[PDB]
Target: RecQ-mediated genome instability protein 1
Amino acid sequence: NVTSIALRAETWLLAAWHVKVPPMWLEACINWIQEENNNVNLSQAQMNKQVFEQWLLTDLRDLEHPLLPDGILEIPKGELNGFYALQINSLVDVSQPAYSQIQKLRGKAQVTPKPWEAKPSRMLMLQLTDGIVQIQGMEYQPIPILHSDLPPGTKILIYGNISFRLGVLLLKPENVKVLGGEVDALLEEYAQE
Model:
């Protein structure tokens, strides 16, 4: 009964959202959901939905379930292929701060060229994790769906062919989908700074 529920929920999580979870966490999650709803007989569809929502609010470190390939941090330059439903511990634009510093360092008939210099585009740097390893994700090309206010713990789907350099993923719009969620436990950490 319970294992059947777990197997169907696990298949659904992977099939629908590319989410991968440890069986021990999953069965405990199902038990917890039944005890919360005071209902032992929720439909599979409703159980699937609530399990996914619990996952979105879960700190991936709790799962102790590796997602990323072993050796991504050791290869100086390469490409990552696959679907990874990861977690954003935090993010910040690194472009504006660097540009700012440079500006200060910049300053410190007759015609004079005044060669247009547009504002360097936003550069979001994400501190990512699958709960086991931590890696960085750079906004290599504009990715509007991402923004500096996404809460710590936000779950994000990283997929396709992704180039990486020195432990940093060079993310492009076609490699990202925001799944949402947040980790309350983490919101307490970064909201202090």
The helical segments are 2-17, 23-37, 44-56, 60-63, 95-107, 184-190. The longest strand covers residues 77-93. The chain has six helices and six strands.
